[PDB]
Each structure stands twice: as C-alpha cells, then as structure tokens.
Design a protein around this nucleic acid. Structure first.
Ligand code: SAH
Ligand code: SAH
Ligand code: MG
Ligand code: MG
Lengths: 190, 204, 207, 62, 55, 204
RNA sequence: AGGAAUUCCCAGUAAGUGCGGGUCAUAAGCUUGCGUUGAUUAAGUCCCUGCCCUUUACACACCGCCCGUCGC
C-alpha cells in the first residue's frame, strides 16, 4: 500500500534539492503518516525532533502562535485547508511546496553578538541545519500569523499564500525578507 | 513606501518644583540641575521641538508618507501619529509631554483616535520588516547625496540624534552617512532629509 | 475577483483595469485568466503569481464578450461593440486574425472541433471558419430582435441562439437550418445547458 | 565566489568568549582534502553538513 | 614554516620527544592536504632523513 | 551675488509690566493683552525665533552668502550681522530683543564690531544696485519652482512674512510667487528658500 | 490589551477548560484535590554576577616544587 497525507497527497514524488537538509526533513517513505497527529515524545532527547515528520512540526509550531495553547485539532484542520488551497491555486503537490518553502526560508549564516552596555558588535557565523529548519518553520508561522491579524482573511489563506510565495522565492513574503536581512547583516559584519 | 524618522536621545523628562510638575528645562530648572551634581546643558527639549516642527509640517507628512518615532534618554519610546498637530510654541508643548509621560497616552479632543502613545522597546520591532536602516552623523568623512539613498518603493528608516553633543550609536543601523560638509542642527537635518524625499517620490 | 465555491471572500483580486469589467474567463490550463473591460483593453493574468502577464489595446468600444479555446491556452477570441472580433492568440503582441461584423457583437462562442467561430450581432448570426481566415460560411437571421446569447449543446450538431423576442432557436450545424423553436414570457438574456440536455435555464429581463 | 559545502569531522567545544557558538572542524566535500575550523550557532553534532558562502575566512586568526 | 623549524630542532638533538610528538600530530590531521601541495615535497624529504636518523 | 531676505510684519515690541521691561509675548501677557481690547494672538514673536534659527544656521549664511532683514509691525528696520549667533532658547532670544529696542544696537561680547543695529526706513535704499524684488505667498494660483528664479551672478531680495495672519504687500516688490500648493510656515518657507539656492551657487 | 524597571519557568513542563470536597490547623469574592487538551527553544561554557572546594591506594601510560607578609 501507499501512504498519502490526508488520503490524497503522496510522498513518493516529493524530492529535496538540498543535500545539507536531507537528514533533517522527515517526509520520505519511513516517516510518511496519514495524519499530522502521532502523540509521540519528540522532545525527550536532543536531536530526536529531527525524526518527527515535518508536517507534524508545522502543526505544532502553528499552535504556539496567536492561539490559546493546547488546541491541536483546530491547527490540523487549518493545515488541511491550507494544503487544499495551495493545491487549488498552484496545481502541484503541496508537500513539495512546503519542502521548497522551508529550504528557501532557512538562513545560511547568522551573526553572533558580543554585547556590552555601550555598544554591541557582531561576527558572522555558520548555522546548523537543525536551526535552519527551526527558523524556517518559525518564520513561516510568524509571517502567516502577522498577515492574518486584523484583516478579513482567515489564517488558512494567509498560510497558503505564505508557503506559495516562499516556495516561489518571491520577496513579497515575510520569511524571505527576514532571511535576506539576516544574511545582509552577516555579510556586513564579516 | 514611507519614511521612518526616529529621534534618538530626546531630553524629555519630568521634574517637580513646588506644587507643580513640568518638563525639565536647562533654564527654568537651573538651580535644581546644579543640585545633585547634574551637569547643566543637556535639558534641551527645544531640539526635539524644532525637529518636530519640521517633520509634521513637511509635505511628505502632508501627503501621508511620514511616520515619526521618539526615543528619549530614559529609554522610553513614543509613537507620533501623522494626524497629530504638535504645539508650535514652547510652553504648551511641555504640557503635552507632562500629559503624555504620566498618562502614557494622549487622546484627540475632536477625534476618537489616539494621537501620542508610549509603546514597548525596542524600536526595531515596529519597523516594517526588510526596511533599510541608516543613521545621520558628521563623523563620516564622505558626503553622501540624499537623493541617491532614497528607495523607489520600499520603506526606509532614518535616525537623527536629538543632542547638541554626542554620537548616534544604536544597534540596528547598518551604515553611517554624512550628507553635508558643515555641522548642522537636528531641526535642519530633519529638513534636508525630508526635502529630498518628496522630489524623488513626486510630491511638489 | 477569484472566488472559492465554498468560501466567503475572494482569494485573489486584480486591480489592473480602470473602468467596469464585463467579461472574464479561464484558459485551457486552469491557472491563467483572460479578462476584458470597458477601458478598451484586454488583459491576461496569472493566478498563483498574482500579477498581470500581458495586456492588449486594439479595440475602439466597449468590450463585453470573450471566449477562450479549450484546446490551446494561447488561443482565445475577444469581441466588442466596436464591430470587430479580434482573436488575440499564440505567443505574440498583436492580433493574428480579425473579423468584421455589421452590428455590435453581443456574444462570441468557439466551436471546439474544426475551428468555427459563431458571432451574434443584432438579428444576424454569422459563422466564420479558421481553416481559411475570415471566411463567412453562413449568415442567418431567424429573430425579429437583437440576438443576445449563443450556446452549444452537448452534441456538436445542436446549436442554440437566444434573443430579445422571447424566442430561442435550435439549429443543426451540418445543415445550418432551424430545427426547433422555444417560446418564453420575457426576453432571454441568458441561456444555459447542463450535461447532455438535462436542464435548460433561461434568465430573463426581470428577476 | 561559488557556494561551498563542508562536513563536520570533529566537535571541539563551546567558545564562551564568542557568545556560545561551537568551534567545529570541517572538511570540504570536494576532493581537495582540506580542513578548517569554523564557528557554528545552534546544535551541531558529528556528521552534519554546513553551507559556506565564504570558504576563506578562518575562525582563529591574528 | 613549522615543519621547516621542526627540522632544525631534531638535528640539534635537544628536546626530541616533545617535537616528535608535536610533529606526528600535524602530519596525521593534515595528511590529505599535505600530499597535494608540491611545494612541500623537499621539506618531507629532509624530514624523512632526519627523523628516523635521530630517533 | 547674494540672497537678501526681509522678514516683513515681524511681531517685536517691548512693553512695561511692574518696573521691568519685557518683550510682548502672547502667552506671558494674557492679563495685559486683554485690556484695551487689542486682539490676542497677533503678538507672535516666536515666528521670528525659528525663522532666524533656520536662516542663520543655513550653510549659505556661514558661507557669507546670506543677508537677513527684519521689518517689524511697528515699522522698525533691523540689520543682522552674518557672524551673529541667535539663541536657541526663546527667553534668551527675548533677552537680546529687549536691549535692541532701547539701546538701538548691541556690540559683540568680544569686540566692538556690530552684530545688531536698527537703521533708517526704508529698506529699499540699502538694497544693492541692479537687484530685482520678488514676493512669496501661498495665495498665488501658479506654483513657481525655486530653481528657476535664481540669478547666476546677481544679488536677490526676497520677502517672507513674519506676521500671524494676512498677506505680504509692499511697494518695492516687483512680482509675487508661490513655492507650493500647501499652507506652509515661515520657518519652512525660509527652510525651502535657503535649500534651493544652495546647490545652484555651488554650496554643498 | 496596559510604559520604565522587575519576578518566575525545562516534559505530560508553560498555557486554557470543567468537575468535586470544606476534611479537629489555615481557608469564603478564598483554599485544596481530581481529570481533559497539551506546546516553542535548550542537553553547554565560566565571558559578567556569584557559590562550594583544593595547590603535598606509586598496575601501564601521563606529569614533575604555588607565592608573599607579620608574629613568636
Ligand atoms: N551634516 C550632517 N549630515 C547628517 N546628519 C547630521 C549632520 N550634521 C549634524 N547631523 C545630525 O544632527 C544631530 C545634531 S548635530 C550635533 C553634532 C554632533 N557632533 C554630530 O554631528 O553628531 C546629530 O545627531 C547628527 O547626527
Ligand atoms: N505655499 C506658500 N508658498 C510661499 N510662501 C508661503 C506659502 N505658504 C505660506 N507662505 C508664507 O508664510 C507666511 C505665513 S503663512 C500666512 C497665512 C497665509 N494664508 C498663507 O497661507 O500664506 C506668509 O507670509 C506667506 O508669505
Ligand atoms: Mg500583558
Ligand atoms: Mg480549573
């Protein structure tokens, strides 16, 4: 049998174009699940949350933002609606869209600060792949939340357009702006 | 597209003499400044006052493309509504801050909208994300043309110090520029930053 | 405005046109739209990108009727009240074919197989072939008022035309002769056919 | 300057002085058999792959 | 440079063990890079003769 | 070539309260001003304050390329030296004005050279030969681009109203122009006027 | 939708929700149990603020003397 997310999105066609992030995005055949709700212990040990599927991580990180915490089913349906809207608008596999968005949104180098009372200075430093994934997911969720606030537009459409723009690589998205400015500051502090 | 102006190091603080509360001025409060070993010549609300008059009456604010932030010396951030009408004369101006600094907000008399509001630090959180952040100072040897630095369709942040002496130094700015070969006041600095912007953005 | 059939607010809004817009349709691929408005211009938009791909300005009156070919996304036809039906098609910056009609063109329809274009102006209904450009194969009038709309049945042979005289005419494409008539209470502004001939819907002058 | 890829061979320790970044030894995925020392922000273990915009800068230099 | 300076230290015969322990650690960690560079060929030839001879 | 600006309708005068001599300020003198029924709000000295600060601080003036004249409502004509420093604080500004009207002039603190001195009416006599006069106001339907009105090597006289309400109208002005479609302050009109003439004459 | 400053917090933990009891002390707009839903980041250094100790079981291997003052 073939395991398809929500019964209709396959995972075999999904491919990752970044060799560095191959080991930290769990979307392939072993990590394929029917629903993003598995009730595992992925925060028990260091580096174990790399085994949690990326859709479940997106569901968890969408619960923290702009919501009373502990409501997971609402977030699952929000993710389902966002995937449906993405498929309707773009016509391709939403899993590939999400993977491309996470690949594009992740910063490559950051700036470590040495700070005193008077002034702060920086040095450009490398970023580990796990922090790349964490910041990508966090930026996408925060951008969707900020776009959805005080607007006649439900969170699902804002999340869908955020993933669409990030996967396209357009600068109209929040995460791309944040990533570009972080790399620009890191370049300036070399 | 918009211009963000942040007034760094504004000398806005409240002191009490007798039974009355009024903002701390170098001249009216000369005796109490000498008390407690405070150096005279930093209580200058006028620098913020003259600088504010230039921004709020500028054509860019008239067209609705100017937003002004004030960061005082006591690390208090104030948001300036473009629809606010600032006092032109010095005395009633100080009443606004005494109204603002204790009550933390100022409501419009003829409108439900707030006009002045104190918000959470740091100021870097409230800028549109991805905006360019540039400061103004004489310490730069190279004189830069303001028109060349203006973005076509993006917001940009310009920081002007509100002190007669000292150097602007905040964490979020990425470059330091000078735009004249002569030392000029903060108020005129407000003028030359804004007056270049309308002509690029087609406001005449 | 793009709308979801299960939502409440538009998913995408396009701001390019300046005056009222009256015709809009998809393409052969389901991700671009072609629109025509009263500012004498016809614009092609991309749905996911949320921007206008291309524009055309080659008409002199109100543009209120348009159709897009199902076979090819590139090929589509635009008609107007300027008495000209210009086909904006292929991948270029100008009309490749144009057609002249003696009355303002209310509606245009593209016959799927064989490249036949049917145009309605006033009483006249005119059929044009694309094997030879701008060839009026047959011009027919069976109405005593302006012809409003033209529809195609599920079968290729049957064709329907509705007008302002409470009367809908059914023709065979092979013979180009009337084979049936329908009579109604008010002038038929809209004529719609379901799968096969399951449901016939006629929308009138009144509510 | 083309984008470079590196593999983490040995994790040295936490700087302390330079924030809390980690000095690691990285060897380039090209068949040049080179190895340098870099500063990494965030959790990193042996076997990780890093993306370098600049392959010339060294962590410990005069 | 340090490989050249180490060659002088072994020849003098003073503090051989500390230099040898230091020398063998550099060769292993940079084994891949040292082979590629043709400029280092003369240095290793002098190091090869001196190291075994002194020990 | 040199820019001459005359401040017309300036509200500068000294009044007697108690035994001391004080400048007639609107806010300070509400009790006195209401008596005799002359209109409150007309006495607006501060308009002269920031106007001088903008003009004197402009790079053109420190270049030696600016002249400022003051023609008050009480028909007093005042010269100002380019080397004069105008106080930033308003009451120190009112301090110097008081000693002008009574002592007719003021010497520098470190030299006998004249910084302020009241001269004889009219202002037209002291104008240099071959100079044409232009007026500035908002009411003009057509807006004039300031870059077009600058002469290459001719001195120039402009009039800016330092009064509260009304319109400038003096005999020696030959033409009347507008610089923007918005109601502007005299300080900003002085700000824009000095800004445009700066680049044309090679001052940066 | 609550400034300046300041307090607390690492896994069924933070946060939301309901349902009981008043138990020889404490508890009434309070106090304590029970269950349901359940997260983001971190698994390491002495850089700041500090705390606790030390500087006299001879396998192999490694290593090879902390300093100063005043009293008797
Ligand atoms: N030529 C110039 N270009 C840009 N900013 C200037 C400027 N001259 C003065 N400023 C700004 O105006 C403010 C007050 S002028 C204060 C002088 C101070 N030595 C200084 O130049 O920093 C300062 O904060 C300064 O940043
Ligand atoms: N748009 C403008 N262009 C040129 N001068 C202006 C101006 N707006 C105001 N001024 C000058 O500024 C001074 C004060 S404004 C005085 C009020 C008058 N209704 C007016 O709008 O001008 C006047 O003396 C006037 O000459
Ligand atoms: Mg709160
Ligand atoms: Mg409870």
């Amino acid at each position: 049998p073939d395991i398809k997310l929500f019964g209709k999105w396959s995972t075999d066609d999904v491919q990752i174009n970044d060799i560095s992030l191959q080991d930290y995005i769990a979307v392939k055949e072993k990590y394929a699940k029917y629903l993003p709700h598995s009730a595992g212990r992925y925060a028990a040990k260091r580096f174990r949350k790399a085994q949690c599927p990326i859709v479940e991580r997106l569901t968890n990180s969408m619960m923290m933002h702009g919501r009373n915490n502990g409501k997971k089913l609402m977030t699952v349906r929000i993710v389902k609606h966002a995937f449906e809207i993405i498929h309707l608008l773009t016509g391709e596999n939403p899993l590939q869209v999400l993977v491309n968005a996470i690949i594009n949104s992740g910063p490559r180098e950051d700036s470590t600060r040495i700070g005193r009372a008077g002034t702060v200075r920086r040095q450009a430093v490398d970023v580990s792949p796990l922090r790349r994934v964490n910041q990508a997911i966090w930026l996408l969720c925060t951008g969707a939340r900020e776009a959805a606030f005080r607007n006649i537009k439900t969170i699902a459409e804002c999340l869908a357009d955020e993933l669409i723009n990030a996967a396209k690589g357009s600068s109209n998205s929040y995460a791309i702006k944040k990533k570009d400015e972080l790399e620009r500051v890191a370049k300036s502090n070399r | 597209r918009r211009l963000i102006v942040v007034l760094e190091g504004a000398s806005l603080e409240t002191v009490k003499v007798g039974k009355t509360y009024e903002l701390l001025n170098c001249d009216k409060h000369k005796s109490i400044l000498l008390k407690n070993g405070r150096d005279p010549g930093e209580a200058r609300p006028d620098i913020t006052h003259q600088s504010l008059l230039m921004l709020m009456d500028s054509p860019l604010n008239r067209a609705g493309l100017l937003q002004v932030y004030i960061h005082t010396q006591k690390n208090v951030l104030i948001e300036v509504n473009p629809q606010t009408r600032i006092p032109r004369t010095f005395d009633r101006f100080c009443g606004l801050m005494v109204q603002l600094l204790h009550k933390l907000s100022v409501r419009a008399a003829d409108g439900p909208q707030k006009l002045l509001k104190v918000i959470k630090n740091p100021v870097s959180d409230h800028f549109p994300v991805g905006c360019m952040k540039v400061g103004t100072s004489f310490s730069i040897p190279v004189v830069s043309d303001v028109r060349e630095l203006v973005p076509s369709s993006d917001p940009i942040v310009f920081v002007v110090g509100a002190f007669a002496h000292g150097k602007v130094s905040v964490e979020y700015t990425e470059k330091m520029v000078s735009i004249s070969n002569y030392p000029l006041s903060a108020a005129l600095t407000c003028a030359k930053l804004t007056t270049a912007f309308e002509e690029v953005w087609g406001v005449i | 405005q793009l709308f979801d059939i299960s939502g409440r607010a538009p998913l995408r809004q396009f701001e390019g046109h300046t005056k009222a817009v009256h015709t809009v349709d998809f393409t052969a691929d389901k991700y671009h739209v072609v629109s025509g408005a009263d500012d004498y211009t016809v614009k092609l938009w991309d749905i996911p990108n949320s921007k206008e791909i291309l524009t055309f300005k080659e008409h002199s009156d109100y543009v209120r009727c348009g159709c897009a070919s199902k076979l090819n996304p590139d090929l589509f036809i635009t008609g107007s009240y300027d008495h000209t039906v210009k086909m904006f098609d292929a991948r270029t910056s100008e009309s490749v074919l144009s057609v002249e009609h003696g009355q303002p063109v209310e509606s245009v329809l593209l016959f799927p197989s064989g490249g036949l274009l049917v145009s309605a102006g006033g009483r006249y209904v005119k059929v044009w072939d694309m094997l030879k450009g701008g060839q009026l194969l047959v011009s027919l009038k069976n109405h005593h008022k302006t012809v409003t709309c033209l529809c195609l049945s599920s079968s290729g042979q049957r064709l329907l035309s509705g007008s302002l005289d409470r009367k809908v005419k059914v023709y065979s494409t092979t013979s180009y002769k009337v084979v049936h008539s329908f009579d109604y209470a008010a002038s038929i502004l809209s004529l719609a056919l379901a799968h096969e001939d399951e449901t016939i819907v006629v929308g009138m002058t009144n509510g | 300057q083309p984008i470079k890829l590196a593999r983490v061979t040995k994790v040295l320790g936490r700087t302390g002085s330079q924030g809390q970044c980690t000095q690691v030894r990285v060897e380039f995925m090209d068949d040049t058999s080179r190895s340098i020392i870099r500063n990494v922000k965030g959790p990193v273990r042996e076997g990780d792959v890093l993306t370098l915009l600049e392959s010339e800068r060294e962590a410990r230099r005069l | 440079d340090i490989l050249k300076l180490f060659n002088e230290f072994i020849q003098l015969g003073s503090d051989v063990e500390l230099i040898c322990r230091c020398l063998f650690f550099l060769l292993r960690i940079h084994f891949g890079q040292i082979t590629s560079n043709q400029m280092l060929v003369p240095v290793i030839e002098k190091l090869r003769e001196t190291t075994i001879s002194k020990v």
